[PDB]
Amino acid sequence: AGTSICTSEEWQGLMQFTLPVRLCKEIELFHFDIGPFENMWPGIFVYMVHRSCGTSCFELEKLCRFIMSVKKNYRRVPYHNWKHAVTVAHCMYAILQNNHTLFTDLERKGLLIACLCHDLDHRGFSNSYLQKFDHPLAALYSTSTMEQHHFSQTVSILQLEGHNIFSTLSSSEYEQVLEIIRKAIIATDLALYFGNRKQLEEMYQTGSLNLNNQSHRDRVIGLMMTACDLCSVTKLWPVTKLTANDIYAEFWAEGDEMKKLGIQPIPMMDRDKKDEVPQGQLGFYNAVAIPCYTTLTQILPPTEPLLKACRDNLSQWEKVIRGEETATWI
Numbered sequence: 001a002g003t004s005i006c007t008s009e010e011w012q013g014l015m016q017f018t019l020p021v022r023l024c025k026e027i028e029l030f031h032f033d034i035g036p037f038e039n040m041w042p043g044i045f046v047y048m049v050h051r052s053c054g055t056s057c058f059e060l061e062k063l064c065r066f067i068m069s070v071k072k073n074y075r076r077v078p079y080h081n082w083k084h085a086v087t088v089a090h091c092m093y094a095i096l097q098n099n100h101t102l103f104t105d106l107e108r109k110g111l112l113i114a115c116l117c118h119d120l121d122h123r124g125f126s127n128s129y130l131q132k133f134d135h136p137l138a139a140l141y142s143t144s145t146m147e148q149h150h151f152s153q154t155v156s157i158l159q160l161e162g163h164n165i166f167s168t169l170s171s172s173e174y175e176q177v178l179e180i181i182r183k184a185i186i187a188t189d190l191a192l193y194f195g196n197r198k199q200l201e202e203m204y205q206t207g208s209l210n211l212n213n214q215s216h217r218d219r220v221i222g223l224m225m226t227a228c229d230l231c232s233v234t235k236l237w238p239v240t241k242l243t244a245n246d247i248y249a250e251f252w253a254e255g256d257e258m259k260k261l262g263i264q265p266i267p268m269m270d271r272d273k274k275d276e277v278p279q280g281q282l283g284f285y286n287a288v289a290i291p292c293y294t295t296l297t298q299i300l301p302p303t304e305p306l307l308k309a310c311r312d313n314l315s316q317w318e319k320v321i322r323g324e325e326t327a328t329w330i
């Protein structure tokens with residue numbers, strides 16, 4: 001109920017934080033895994049905003065209140081949580097650093113914020129669930145149901161006293177950035193991704209793609225959002241594999257609720273069907289991740305390491321299917 005607000009101790013604590021020097025180098029790399037540095041996550045986000053957008057892009061007090069309140073509005077769910085938020089934001093930073101002047105200052109700040117915020121107040125339930133059982137959210141938001149909620153939650157956070165990090169923008173740039181953020185968040189609806197990716201592939205292959213064309217820009221940004229949302233699949237295998245455990249933990253909890261409502265869940269969400277997971281992952285990589293990073297690499301060549309990593313993980317799932325797994329810890 002209502003929007004949660006960070007404590008003074010929380011945001012002041014973040015203000016005083018300094019990132020260990022060794023990580024400054026690592027954070028630049030696509031494969032960087034935030035996993036082992038939980039206490040540093042919010043500081044890691046400040047760092048990325050500061051490197052990408054300058055230490056004066058936002059008032060530091062407002063930025064630190066914003067970040068710690070964002071954290072407090074992620075729920076303690078197995079996957080769509082704070083850790084996922086910072087991970088997605090880190091992928092965006094890496095894409096932007098490698099593609100820096102293709103994007104405006106306003107686009108970089110909006111996108112880094114959009115990624116941090118893009119799953120705000122996720123409950124561990126899919127759009128499929130919300131719509132199947134007519135959750136109130138589905139009444140309010142007929143398509144892209146959770147994504148429209150994530151955007152609404154973002155704007156609610158900006159509206160907290162002292163949290164409006166975009167207040168100092170010109171009224172016109174203010175409207176532009178909220179639009180950048182809205183579009184970016186809505187684009188994290190995977191339902192939209194299939195069409196977007198297909199469109200982009202065609203525009204690329206015919207050579208009509210034009211980043212001076214706002215609709216094209218929006219689409220490229222959309223695909224960047226997908227690439228970042230799915231970046232678990234671009235990490236080193238052990239990291240990818242542990243993250244998959246958390247994702248399925250959420251799926252099986254949803255499947256359980258469906259069973260209570262008289263409906264057998266899709267196999268992916270069925271905890272009595274774990275034998276099908278390796279094949280399910282294969283389908284996911286072949287249908288979603290591989291094409292995503294393939295097209296992104298065509299459009300932004302510096303993102304190639306994402307695609308190489310995703311390819312290596314596909315291979316690992318293939319090995320699992322064939323019975324070639326080595327030891328795994330959970």
Ligand SMILES: Cc1cc(C)nc(N)n1
Nearest residue numbers: 230232233244247281284
């Ligand atoms: C977000 C997501 C969803 C699925 C089915 N697999 C993976 N790896 N990631």
Ligand code: NI
Nearest residue numbers: 118119146188
């Ligand atoms: Ni989402």
Ligand code: NI
Nearest residue numbers: 118119188229
């Ligand atoms: Ni997400």
